[PDB]
Amino acid sequence: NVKAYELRTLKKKELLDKLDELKKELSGLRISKALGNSAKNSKIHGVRKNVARVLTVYNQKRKMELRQLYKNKKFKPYNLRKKLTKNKRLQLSPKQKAAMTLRQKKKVQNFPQRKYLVV
Amino acid sequence: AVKLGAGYETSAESWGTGRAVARIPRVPGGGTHRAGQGAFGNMCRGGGMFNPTKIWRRWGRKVNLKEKRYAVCSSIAASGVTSLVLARGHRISHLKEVPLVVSNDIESLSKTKEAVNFLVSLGLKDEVNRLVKSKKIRAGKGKMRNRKYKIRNG
Amino acid sequence: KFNKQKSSSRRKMRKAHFTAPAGLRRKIMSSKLSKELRLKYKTRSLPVRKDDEVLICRGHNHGREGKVVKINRKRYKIYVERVTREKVNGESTFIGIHPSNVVLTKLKVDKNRKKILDRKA
Amino acid sequence: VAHNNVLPNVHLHKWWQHRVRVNFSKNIKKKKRRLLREKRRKANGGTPIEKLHPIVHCPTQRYNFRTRLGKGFTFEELKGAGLTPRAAQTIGICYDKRRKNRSEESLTKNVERLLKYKNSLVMIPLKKNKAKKGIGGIPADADKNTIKEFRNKKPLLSIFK
RNA sequence: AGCACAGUCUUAACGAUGGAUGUCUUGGUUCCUACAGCGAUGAAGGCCGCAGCAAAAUGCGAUACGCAAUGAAAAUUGCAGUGACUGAAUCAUCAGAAUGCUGAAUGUAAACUACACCAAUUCCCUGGGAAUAGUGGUACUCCUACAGAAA
RNA sequence: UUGUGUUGAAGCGAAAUACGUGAGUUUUCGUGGAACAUCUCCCUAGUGCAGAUCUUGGUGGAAGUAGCAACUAUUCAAAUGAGAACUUUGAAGACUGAAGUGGAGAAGGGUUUCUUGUCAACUGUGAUUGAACAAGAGUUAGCCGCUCCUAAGGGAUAGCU
RNA sequence: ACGGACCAAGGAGUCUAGCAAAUGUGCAAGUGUAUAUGAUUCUUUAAACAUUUUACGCAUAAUUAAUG
RNA sequence: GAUGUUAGGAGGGCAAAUCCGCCGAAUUUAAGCAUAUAAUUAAGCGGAAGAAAAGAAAAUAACUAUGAUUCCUUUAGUAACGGCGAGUGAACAAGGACCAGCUCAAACGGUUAAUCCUUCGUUUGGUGCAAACCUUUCGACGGAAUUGUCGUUGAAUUAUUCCAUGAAUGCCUUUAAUUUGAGCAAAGUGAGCAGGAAUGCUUCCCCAUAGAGGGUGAAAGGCCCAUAGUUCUUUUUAAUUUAUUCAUUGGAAUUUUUCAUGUCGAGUCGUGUUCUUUGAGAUUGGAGCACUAAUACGUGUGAUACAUUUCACAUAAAGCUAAAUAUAUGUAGGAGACCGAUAGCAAACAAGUACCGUGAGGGAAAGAUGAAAUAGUACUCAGGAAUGAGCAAUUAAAUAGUACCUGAAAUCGUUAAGAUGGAACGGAUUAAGAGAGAAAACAAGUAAAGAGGGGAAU
Numbered sequence A: 001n002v003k004a005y006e007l008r009t010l011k012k013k014e015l016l017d018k019l020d021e022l023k024k025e026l027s028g029l030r031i032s033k034a035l036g037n038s039a040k041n042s043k044i045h046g047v048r049k050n051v052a053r054v055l056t057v058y059n060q061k062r063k064m065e066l067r068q069l070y071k072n073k074k075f076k077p078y079n080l081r082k083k084l085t086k087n088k089r090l091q092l093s094p095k096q097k098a099a100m101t102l103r104q105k106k107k108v109q110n111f112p113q114r115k116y117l118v119v
Numbered sequence B: 001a002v003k004l005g006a007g008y009e010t011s012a013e014s015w016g017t018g019r020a021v022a023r024i025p026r027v028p029g030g031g032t033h034r035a036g037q038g039a040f041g042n043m044c045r046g047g048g049m050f051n052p053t054k055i056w057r058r059w060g061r062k063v064n065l066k067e068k069r070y071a072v073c074s075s076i077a078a079s080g081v082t083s084l085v086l087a088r089g090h091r092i093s094h095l096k097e098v099p100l101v102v103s104n105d106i107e108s109l110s111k112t113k114e115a116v117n118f119l120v121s122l123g124l125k126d127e128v129n130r131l132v133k134s135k136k137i138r139a140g141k142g143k144m145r146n147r148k149y150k151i152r153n154g
Numbered sequence C: 001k002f003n004k005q006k007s008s009s010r011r012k013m014r015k016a017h018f019t020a021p022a023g024l025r026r027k028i029m030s031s032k033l034s035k036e037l038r039l040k041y042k043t044r045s046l047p048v049r050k051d052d053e054v055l056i057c058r059g060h061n062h063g064r065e066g067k068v069v070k071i072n073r074k075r076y077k078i079y080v081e082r083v084t085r086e087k088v089n090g091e092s093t094f095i096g097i098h099p100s101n102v103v104l105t106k107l108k109v110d111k112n113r114k115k116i117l118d119r120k121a
Numbered sequence D: 001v002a003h004n005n006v007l008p009n010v011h012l013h014k015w016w017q018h019r020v021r022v023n024f025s026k027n028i029k030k031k032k033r034r035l036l037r038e039k040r041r042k043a044n045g046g047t048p049i050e051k052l053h054p055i056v057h058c059p060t061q062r063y064n065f066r067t068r069l070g071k072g073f074t075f076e077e078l079k080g081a082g083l084t085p086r087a088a089q090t091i092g093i094c095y096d097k098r099r100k101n102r103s104e105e106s107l108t109k110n111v112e113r114l115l116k117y118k119n120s121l122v123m124i125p126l127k128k129n130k131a132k133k134g135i136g137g138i139p140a141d142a143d144k145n146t147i148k149e150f151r152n153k154k155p156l157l158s159i160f161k
Numbered sequence E: 001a002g003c004a005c006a007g008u009c010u011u012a013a014c015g016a017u018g019g020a021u022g023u024c025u026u027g028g029u030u031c032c033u034a035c036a037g038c039g040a041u042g043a044a045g046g047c048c049g050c051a052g053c054a055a056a057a058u059g060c061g062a063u064a065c066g067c068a069a070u071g072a073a074a075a076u077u078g079c080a081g082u083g084a085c086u087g088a089a090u091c092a093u094c095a096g097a098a099u100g101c102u103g104a105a106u107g108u109a110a111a112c113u114a115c116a117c118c119a120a121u122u123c124c125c126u127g128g129g130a131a132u133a134g135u136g137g138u139a140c141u142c143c144u145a146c147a148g149a150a151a
Numbered sequence F: 001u002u003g004u005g006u007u008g009a010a011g012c013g014a015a016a017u018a019c020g021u022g023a024g025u026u027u028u029c030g031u032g033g034a035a036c037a038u039c040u041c042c043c044u045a046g047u048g049c050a051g052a053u054c055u056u057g058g059u060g061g062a063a064g065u066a067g068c069a070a071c072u073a074u075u076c077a078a079a080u081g082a083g084a085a086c087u088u089u090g091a092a093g094a095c096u097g098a099a100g101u102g103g104a105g106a107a108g109g110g111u112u113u114c115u116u117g118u119c120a121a122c123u124g125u126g127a128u129u130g131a132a133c134a135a136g137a138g139u140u141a142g143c144c145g146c147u148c149c150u151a152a153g154g155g156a157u158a159g160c161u
Numbered sequence G: 001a002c003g004g005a006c007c008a009a010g011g012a013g014u015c016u017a018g019c020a021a022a023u024g025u026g027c028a029a030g031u032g033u034a035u036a037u038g039a040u041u042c043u044u045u046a047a048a049c050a051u052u053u054u055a056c057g058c059a060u061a062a063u064u065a066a067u068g
Numbered sequence H: 001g002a003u004g005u006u007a008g009g010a011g012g013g014c015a016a017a018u019c020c021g022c023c024g025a026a027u028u029u030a031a032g033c034a035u036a037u038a039a040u041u042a043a044g045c046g047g048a049a050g051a052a053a054a055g056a057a058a059a060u061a062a063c064u065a066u067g068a069u070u071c072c073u074u075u076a077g078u079a080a081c082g083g084c085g086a087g088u089g090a091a092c093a094a095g096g097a098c099c100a101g102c103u104c105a106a107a108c109g110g111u112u113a114a115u116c117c118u119u120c121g122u123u124u125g126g127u128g129c130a131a132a133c134c135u136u137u138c139g140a141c142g143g144a145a146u147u148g149u150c151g152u153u154g155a156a157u158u159a160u161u162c163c164a165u166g167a168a169u170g171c172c173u174u175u176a177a178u179u180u181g182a183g184c185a186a187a188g189u190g191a192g193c194a195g196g197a198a199u200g201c202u203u204c205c206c207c208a209u210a211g212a213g214g215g216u217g218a219a220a221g222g223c224c225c226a227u228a229g230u231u232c233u234u235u236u237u238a239a240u241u242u243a244u245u246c247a248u249u250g251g252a253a254u255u256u257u258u259c260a261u262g263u264c265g266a267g268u269c270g271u272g273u274u275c276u277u278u279g280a281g282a283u284u285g286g287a288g289c290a291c292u293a294a295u296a297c298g299u300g301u302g303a304u305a306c307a308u309u310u311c312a313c314a315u316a317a318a319g320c321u322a323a324a325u326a327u328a329u330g331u332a333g334g335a336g337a338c339c340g341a342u343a344g345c346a347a348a349c350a351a352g353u354a355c356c357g358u359g360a361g362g363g364a365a366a367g368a369u370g371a372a373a374u375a376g377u378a379c380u381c382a383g384g385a386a387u388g389a390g391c392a393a394u395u396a397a398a399u400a401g402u403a404c405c406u407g408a409a410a411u412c413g414u415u416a417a418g419a420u421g422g423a424a425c426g427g428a429u430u431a432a433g434a435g436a437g438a439a440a441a442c443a444a445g446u447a448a449a450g451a452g453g454g455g456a457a458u
């Protein structure tokens, strides 16, 4: 019945080892269930949950390392890329949208939309 | 308004004359209890209603501004007149003057309790009591359309 | 009422009541605390837990005090120590009382409860 | 058709039901619009949400006598006012490149109006405190106290009508 | 212990049959408001699964009626089992992880779990040591850049 | 607007020295178990049914009637069981008569197969039987096929429309 | 002659556009505040109120193919 | 030009209510029908967005002229079209909503592409626990580009004044709102009656910026959730506060005076002809084909073809652009003088489900016990069993027993009464029965004495 916060500290190899053990345990439980038994039939669920948790932890760890590896460097694996709606991705960056022609920019600089309190 | 395609979403058609059944359109195919049954038509289970209600019915009624003003004036006059007020159902047996005028101090009252007290002092105690009594559960299906209680107008 | 974001609609309200999540159920199964308790804390009503001792005001047993054995969020009923009743078979089960019909005296107090009290204050 | 009634001219031979708009939303729509306007005003702190339009005479033999707000001031009028078009645009005034003057009197009137508007208006500096004179047409930036005083007074919308 | 003929029809009482009426109502309905694209980063749709005792629906995806994390916060319960005395039992939220096979389906195919070819691929530890026939990729059109050939 | 309700509302069934020319209204008893009125005025409507070979759902007379007549045909004893003409076993007598209700397969079906149960309904009679219901269980290939090839053909590549 | 075995529920001149006369009402050579704005309007408030510190409709004039 | 599983990328499909193109009918109306009408509609196919499309005048007007589109009110059922039949049918103005303008091409700049992009980088910042973003300027190595990128919007030259700039020191305050999630949140669980149980009926209290609504064993402001109101935090966006110094590169608007009269979109407009579309009429737009222009003194509108000439207004044949406006689709809220299980979506329920159809498709029926099944029928007897019965049993109530609220009618059963010679029923008028009944169908008051209730006088 191991929980997440205990597993974050453990090295990856150790985690893997734990996972395999859990799997083995689960297998045993399954076997028992298959045979004419109902003694530990309810224990299996917990084990499964634990296994899942372990997997999640390991996956997260893997992801983190991957992220670390691919820091910056322009292009990145599409998974590590900021996954967002396709349309949004397609869409120009706000800066790009803003970017006016030089003359226009100059004009803007010259005569901005001033505030002109009327009394 | 009833939905636009209500009762008419069916492909049902009439079998014609020589099958020994009325000539209302009939649901096609088989297997279902619905198959073979009368389709649309106001008389048919699951049919469309007669003249289905529509959003374009005239709901509001324009009234001459002048007419409205006149009505308002009349109402005001009625309110002034003690007898009329009495008739309308308000318990006015204990009020000196029925054009009721009270000091500007009222506009500044901050507490419902205080207001109630003031009312009582005026002579409307009976009226207040009546009002209290008269919150009652409506007869009918109104109960189910956010009109649960009925309350008389004070 | 005055805020037009929350529905008054009766049907909607009923739906909400019936289909409320567990937390919501817990929240709405609150009970009035005794006069002394009220005096002690700025709280008027608390969500009843397990080891709270309650006194029943409404129903057939309108004065029988006792600790709560179990609370049931599925049926909105709490079960007291000695509100026992035999079924048809003869099996003894607790009579379920709605938290509205009950006023709590002795309070089960954990850190969470303390926090809640503080918040209320 | 029967009896002495007018001959029926109700054009409902097309699938008209397919295109009926009932404006249940009228009053509410109006309210929404008002709210939006208010919001805009708030955003544009102090400044008036409305832009200056010149008075102009309506076309055709039948509306000739009447005068109404036209969109945009015409270069000539701007010049008369002593203002650049761009500057005018930046401030409260609409400019109209396409409009032309054939009435000297009208032009004069327009320029008078412009002058009046200018007189009315006080210009908040672009950067805080730093009081600097305008470009081409734009008047001057007043001090802080004056601005405050102006704010304290009610912003009139008499010119924009 | 006796006594009514029987049947057909009628009336009344009390029943059957049926589900009308009445009363409800977690549904609909129209209107109003508000926002409003998902997809080769593999969508919608469809299969296949997944629970201890598990059909459907609901929920989810080989971590499979849920994982992590956050906010609550002692229960969950048909039984079995699991927890409290707060990352744990249960909700809610959901941003992280994960997301079978398919399907635009995109290697060629398709009443196939058929078949190619190019990478062997993957994980562990701080360059070795383990693994698995397993995992990727390879469509058509196009664009920019590059490449080396053609005229 | 001014009221009736768990000392029982609406509804329903029977009525009533009841009222109304009449639609109806009102009341009593019985059931019922929660709402109900307005005639004070008027406002609004998906507002009143005996018919439409009306729609839907129900129910009759017909009527315990027609009928349960292809495939030559059963009988005795015993067993199981609450109960046996149609479950099982034995003994007869019979038929199918290798162009077979026999073996295998294909299409189609999809667990109908098998064992242990077993009878609410179904098995147009009965039924303890069952292709029913319930619980399980069962289909093992290098050689038998598919998988490969081409056929009539099909879907596409280049184009061109 | 047709429809109706029986019973229960459902089941059919409605709604909008413009015109008409009838009658009610307000105002009346005028009338209707259209959109839209404004508010110390915001459960009801999608209504009610208000109408800018010569809008348009119909009517007030007819007639003629017509410049008129 | 091919070619590449080269490096980096994009398109395909789903979804449609509004939206934009295409393509495209017929029923129908004309009391027939053929032009018309339906209708530039449905279906078909293709494409977008939160809106789309339209849009910055080759516009209208003929005025004292207006000044991009869009949308609303209106013009207007008007001009017009139409077997001048049925029918159809705009636009300008006017009042509003909202208001926003622009940049390519061409002219100019060669004492020089001043541009642009891929890849590899380099170092100051700001947030966040991370993940990540957010910006800052600077060069390489490539390319692209002279078949043309970028600057300028005629060109200089004067006066005026702004705007960018960079560094030091400097401050980050007070509120108003606006929008998310949050808490907190007034006062009876008082007698008595009846009840299974008050939230009821009396009566004594109160609270209300909360008497919306829901729950709770019957109608509850005071039992609970919530509600009125506030106290934070979230979203941004106004106002207020603190800017001060030094460096110069660049630019802009006017304003003088010179000099330059530039440029302004071609198989395009236009005409002829065909078909379509239009209210468009000797053709409104569009399209196919044939012919095929003019340079701003141009050429295109100015609703009758044409010639000769005025005049007014525009500047076509390149492009972009917010606002108002529309939404029967999807999700999420809020509503109703709406519907109340044959109604309302087809679907209140394991409904687009079962089931039917080879298939395209078609497509149901089906809600309610009670307050509480943590009261779902214990036990005994008879039964093969179902069931039944109980002296038994849960309930307030089982003729509330899960086919469960109420339980109508048809139909059928039991009992009783009656009637009965090939119908029955009915109306009119009695009759005998059999039920019902007393509020007109007799008895006010007076007296003796019980049980209650009142009101008043002092």
Ligand SMILES: [Mg+2]
Pocket (backbone or CB within 6 Å): B006, B007, B046, B047, B048
């Ligand atoms: Mg319907």
Ligand SMILES: [Mg+2]
Pocket (backbone or CB within 6 Å): B140
């Ligand atoms: Mg009713």
Ligand SMILES: [Mg+2]
Pocket (backbone or CB within 6 Å): none
């Ligand atoms: Mg007899």
Ligand SMILES: [Mg+2]
Pocket (backbone or CB within 6 Å): none
């Ligand atoms: Mg967790």
Ligand SMILES: [Mg+2]
Pocket (backbone or CB within 6 Å): E087
């Ligand atoms: Mg937690």
Ligand SMILES: [Mg+2]
Pocket (backbone or CB within 6 Å): none
């Ligand atoms: Mg493939």
Ligand SMILES: [Mg+2]
Pocket (backbone or CB within 6 Å): E112
């Ligand atoms: Mg094959």
Ligand SMILES: [Mg+2]
Pocket (backbone or CB within 6 Å): none
């Ligand atoms: Mg009634």
Ligand SMILES: [Mg+2]
Pocket (backbone or CB within 6 Å): B050, F046
């Ligand atoms: Mg009707």
Ligand SMILES: [Mg+2]
Pocket (backbone or CB within 6 Å): none
């Ligand atoms: Mg009938």
Ligand SMILES: [Mg+2]
Pocket (backbone or CB within 6 Å): F051
């Ligand atoms: Mg009739």
Ligand SMILES: [Mg+2]
Pocket (backbone or CB within 6 Å): none
């Ligand atoms: Mg029938």
Ligand SMILES: [Mg+2]
Pocket (backbone or CB within 6 Å): none
């Ligand atoms: Mg048989």
Ligand SMILES: [Mg+2]
Pocket (backbone or CB within 6 Å): F095, F097
């Ligand atoms: Mg033989």
Ligand SMILES: [Mg+2]
Pocket (backbone or CB within 6 Å): none
């Ligand atoms: Mg033979």
Ligand SMILES: [Mg+2]
Pocket (backbone or CB within 6 Å): none
């Ligand atoms: Mg055989």
